[PDB]
């Protein structure tokens, strides 16, 4: 069994490798990637995702979120708060303030120390989930904009035709924005570039040990956990590396900076904070080993999670059973 430790490997493709993405992941998967939950990804030296980010600032950022803590600093919940709409630009000068700039730091490990010892006490604002790409349309390799979709995927495997789409999604980040510890809807692959801006750690649990994360988020949340049988699906709830290792949850962690992806693997539970101003892209896609992921995912059908219109089919076809109660939490 390759990578039986189920550490995070770091890929460095070729521009010959770099043409078929499919076979890329295949190949990560057959020297042992997935296990681990998440993967890096170097691009070879000869691509780039454009030519210059110089002319993005007048992208808006419709419903910036305002993320507020509750808890201890190992172990705290966060709710979103809509705030006005403000620009690009206009985001990446608030981020640089002093009210919410990255704090002087010797290194990526001071910062991390920094981060779980402060992070409740401030509310730092993320421009999160935007429908849009910074990939330019010539760039043919790794282009989050042109893979596969989803919807076509399940159909070459399954041969049920769906509707639904997949496009990707933009982050711009500031220094301690947070992504709570989740899995993707239906347990997805997802992809992520960092496309520009100061870095992002990610921490992660194998797939292989995700119910062990569950099983500790329950007690630690014991409200949350009542209210339903899936709330890490609310993408609200953060544990710290020092609470993980007291508690004895299997982790890594992996700093992503500027120019590289990440690929998070089905069912492999990540959370994560940015350093500074940046800005990402992601997306989810599948492969034909997802589908029995796919068949197997939690849901939340007590209404918070709220999500996609694509994932209606994804729950109608591979979860006939579970559609019903899911699809009255929907609406
Ligand atoms: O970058 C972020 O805030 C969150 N991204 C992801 O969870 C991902 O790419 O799967
Ligand atoms: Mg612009
Ligand atoms: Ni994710
Ligand atoms: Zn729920």
Redesign the pocket.
């Known amino acids: 069994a390759q990578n039986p430790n189920c550490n995070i490997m770091i890929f460095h493709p070729t521009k010959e490798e770099f043409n078929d993405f499919d076979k890329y992941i295949a190949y990560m998967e057959s020297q042992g990637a997935h296990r681990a939950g998440l993967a890096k990804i170097i691009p070879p030296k000869e691509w780039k995702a454009r030519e210059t980010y110089d002319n993005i600032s007048e992208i808006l950022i419709a419903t910036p979120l305002q993320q507020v803590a509750s808890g201890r600093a190992g172990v705290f919940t966060q709710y979103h708060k809509k705030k006005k709409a403000m620009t690009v630009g206009e985001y990446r000068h608030l981020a640089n303030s002093k009210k919410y700039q990255t704090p002087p730091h010797q290194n990526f490990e001071d910062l991390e120390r920094k981060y779980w010892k402060n992070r409740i006490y401030n509310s730092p604002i993320?421009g999160?989930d935007i429908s849009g790409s910074l990939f330019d349309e010539n760039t043919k390799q790794w282009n989050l904009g042109h893979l596969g979709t989803i919807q076509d995927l399940l159909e070459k495997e399954c041969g049920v035709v769906i509707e639904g789409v997949n496009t990707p999604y933009l982050?711009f980040?500031m220094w301690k924005?947070?992504?709570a510890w989740?899995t993707?809807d239906m347990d997805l692959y997802?992809?992520?570039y960092l496309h520009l801006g100061e870095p992002?750690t990610w921490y992660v649990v194998p797939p292989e040990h995700g119910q062990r994360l569950e099983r500790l988020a329950r007690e630690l949340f014991p409200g949350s956990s009542r209210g339903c049988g899936a709330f890490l699906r609310h993408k609200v709830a953060l544990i710290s590396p020092t609470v993980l290792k007291e508690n004895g949850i299997p982790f890594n962690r992996i700093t992503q900076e500027a120019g590289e992806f990440?690929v998070?693997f089905p069912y492999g539970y990540?959370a994560?904070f940015?350093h500074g101003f940046n800005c990402?892209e992601?997306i989810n896609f599948a492969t034909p080993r997802w589908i029995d992921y796919g068949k197997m995912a939690s849901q939340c059908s007590c209404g918070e999670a709220r999500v996609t219109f694509s994932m209606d089919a994804f729950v109608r076809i591979l979860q006939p059973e579970r559609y019903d109660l899911w699809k009255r939490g929907q609406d």
């Open positions: 993320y999160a982050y980040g924005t947070t992504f989740h993707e997802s992809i992520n992002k990440m998070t990540h994560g940015n990402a992601a």
